Ligand SMILES: *[C@@H]1O[C@H](CO)[C@@H](O[C@@H]2O[C@H](CO)[C@@H](O)[C@H](O)[C@H]2NC(C)=O)[C@H](O)[C@H]1NC(C)=O
Ligand SMILES: *[C@@H]1O[C@H](CO)[C@@H](O[C@@H]2O[C@H](CO)[C@@H](O)[C@H](O)[C@H]2NC(C)=O)[C@H](O)[C@H]1NC(C)=O
Ligand SMILES: [Ca+2]
Ligand SMILES: [Ca+2]
Ligand SMILES: [Ca+2]
Ligand SMILES: [Ca+2]
Ligand SMILES: [Ca+2]
Ligand SMILES: [Ca+2]
Ligand SMILES: [Ca+2]
Ligand SMILES: [Ca+2]
Ligand SMILES: [Ca+2]
Ligand SMILES: [Ca+2]
Ligand SMILES: [Ca+2]
Ligand SMILES: [Ca+2]
């Protein structure tokens with residue numbers, strides 16, 4: 001019942017033009033850190049050595065599951081990086097089957113291993129019976145899809161499974177062969193419903209039966225939800241996807257009664273304005289990022305033991321926050337909408 | 353939006369007979385690692401240096417919040433340890449006000465900081481209105497209390513608040529002054545209901561109005577729930593609290609449809625047998641301990657992508673597991689009860 005400690009065995013090496021084919025052959029799943037060359041100062045060297053140690057621990061933990069880790073220097077190994085498609089420094093590229101999955105989240109052994117374990121699972125989860133259907137309906141912090149097919153041999157299910165591989169493990173794909181589940185979901189045979197994160201009502205993919213290409217293109221177009229949750233596994237991907245250099249950031253601790261009350265108002269506002277293409281709200285639950293809470297309180301000058309919502313300038317990390325006297329001074333849906341209007345029409349921005 | 357890195361400033365020192373009064377005076381909240389003296393070999397020294405570095409990072413993150421960290425050598429500093437009440441090696445003792453809170457969970461900067469942030473919050477959360485009441489009802493993985501009082505100046509509320517301090521932050525204490533909330537909860541004025549983890553029906557504390565002593569003694573007697581969840585913040589406390597050297601361990605991924613279905617059966621069985629004093633089940637959700645999943649799969653010889661339940665021999669880590677062909681071969685409540693009966697009456701044990 002005790003956490004693993006690094007055993008000193010060198011399992012993570014630099015992946016270069018000489019060895020890369022043998023590395024790909026040695027491992028069923030290969031995760032490659034694409035990194036800039038470390039600077040020569042002692043601090044950057046120490047930081048680089050500590051980064052490699054993180055991969056060594058993950059490689060030890062996942063050795064018996066066919067996972068390997070490597071490192072690609074973006075300058076020294078620029079040619080191999082180009083052939084393999086490694087373009088974003090500090091991203092980890094995970095090779096499973098015919099897909100290349102970009103990891104752009106917290107660089108920690110625990111978060112990396114959890115991600116790899118999700119990668120190793122199958123990309124479609126079946127739903128049969130009432131309890132499994134309830135488990136499906138409880139998912140709201142992720143975009144999700146569900147389709148109804150004849151059986152696992154259906155050409156349309158196989159297209160659906162192939163599409164699921166493209167977005168694995170970020171967007172869970174569900175399938176049912178149970179006409180009673182499908183009827184409850186209002187899914188006609190071979191229809192696919194896309195449930196945007198935190199939305200109650202789905203969007204049916206048009207022109208069924210759907211091909212892999214029709215599903216992929218649909219998901220790409222609905223990928224960005226009106227309300228999306230910051231998660232360690234994807235925090236930098238989410239944070240780097242700003243809209244004109246602005247994030248609306250809502251802090252709410254889901255388990256706290258005041259956070260829940262505010263989060264419920266936020267969800268209701270997102271649902272009523274889900275079609276506004278200029279509206280994108282990031283919900284950060286502070287309990288998921290304890291090491292950042294003091295930094296956020298200092299940088300934004302807010303008390304994160306209470307709900308908050310603001311506009312964040314990503315370049316200078318400048319901000320403006322809705323004025324709430326305390327945790328009990330929460331805005332109504334109408335007040336929150338109007339405040340959002342002000343941020344969108346520019347009435348409320350960091351540059352004033 | 354970037355994790356803090358240790359800045360090299362020495363904030364964590366050994367706490368000994370010469371300095372301990374000044375350390376206690378320097379910090380509003382003080383967390384002391386009570387540790388055995390490190391061995392002289394290079395590995396134990398490196399491990400000891402890395403452990404101190406964890407505290408340094410936590411101390412940096414929480415410096416502006418009045419938190420300090422120290423280390424007490426159980427041999428060199430045995431006398432100070434005795435005066436301060438430090439008895440369990442590898443535990444962190446947190447001093448807040450008149451209380452001493454034992455931390456016996458994952459030794460990591462993120463988990464430590466999250467715990468300290470919970471310690472710093474007030475020990476009673478108020479409930480007013482329908483949404484806050486819903487937030488209270490959503491809590492099930494913890495024991496919880498809720499009491500109805502006249503107002504914050506009530507002598508009975510103050511006794512309740514004093515009792516909450518004893519168990520902070522492990523057992524959340526809730527209070528309401530709202531007669532409409534209280535009526536919905538069936539709480540008479542100054543009554544306190546204790547909701548055991550995962551139970552639907554509460555137990556009312558007898559002989560109200562209740563004193564601090566009556567509440568504390570009650571909570572101590574109901575502290576161990578029939579079903580309890582392994583959490584990083586308390587994993588070793590929970591794991592060290594075995595019943596005759598045996599844990600019943602249930603693996604279920606709450607978000608997975610098969611895990612949910614099994615977890616729902618487990619909850620139903622726990623509720624129907626909540627008064628069996630010999631029954632204690634530990635639920636481990638694998639998504640909370642990714643770095644341990646491969647180790648558990650190897651040690652117990654089970655596939656943790658599916659639900660599992662077994663009997664664990666803590667000395668030799670030996671085990672026996674309910675035989676489930678796959679994720680869809682889940683037991684009914686009756687089958688699970690009978691299996692539990694077998695483990696309790698000895699019919700199923702690791703020694704066979
Ligand atoms: C976000 O912050 C950046 C940096 O503070 C802003 O950039 C400045 O914008 C003003 C007005 O356009 C210029 O006068 C400055 O010269 C800019 N400085 C730099 C370094 O570019 C940016 O305008 C802000 N954007 C939003 C949407 O708030
Ligand atoms: C749990 O495991 C320990 C260690 O394997 C068991 O201890 C052994 O018990 C048998 C039978 O009582 C003795 O013959 C051995 O000599 C014991 N060995 C040691 C080292 O003590 C223990 O009995 C097991 N307990 C349960 C409840 O399964
Ligand atoms: Ca190496
Ligand atoms: Ca493809
Ligand atoms: Ca990036
Ligand atoms: Ca962790
Ligand atoms: Ca439909
Ligand atoms: Ca078509
Ligand atoms: Ca990216
Ligand atoms: Ca609160
Ligand atoms: Ca409140
Ligand atoms: Ca939308
Ligand atoms: Ca917390
Ligand atoms: Ca957490």
Ligand SMILES: [Ca+2]
Pocket residue numbers: 257258261327328329330484
């Ligand atoms: Ca409130």
Ligand SMILES: [Ca+2]
Pocket residue numbers: 362363364365404408
């Ligand atoms: Ca030090």
Ligand SMILES: [Ca+2]
Pocket residue numbers: 450451518
């Ligand atoms: Ca006391």
Ligand SMILES: [Ca+2]
Pocket residue numbers: 440441442443456588589592
């Ligand atoms: Ca211990």
Ligand SMILES: [Ca+2]
Pocket residue numbers: 108110111232462
């Ligand atoms: Ca973490």
Ligand SMILES: [Ca+2]
Pocket residue numbers: 537538539540556
């Ligand atoms: Ca009652």
Ligand SMILES: [Ca+2]
Pocket residue numbers: 559560561562563566
């Ligand atoms: Ca009394």
Ligand SMILES: [Ca+2]
Pocket residue numbers: 440443454456589
């Ligand atoms: Ca303990």
Ligand SMILES: [Ca+2]
Pocket residue numbers: 125608609610611657679
């Ligand atoms: Ca499953």
Ligand SMILES: [Ca+2]
Pocket residue numbers: 126127128132609610679680
């Ligand atoms: Ca299933």
Ligand SMILES: [Ca+2]
Pocket residue numbers: 548576577578625626627628
């Ligand atoms: Ca019980």
Ligand SMILES: [Ca+2]
Pocket residue numbers: 114117118639
């Ligand atoms: Ca997972």
Ligand SMILES: [Ca+2]
Pocket residue numbers: 639640
């Ligand atoms: Ca997790």
Ligand SMILES: [Ca+2]
Pocket residue numbers: 132609610613679680681682
């Ligand atoms: Ca099932």
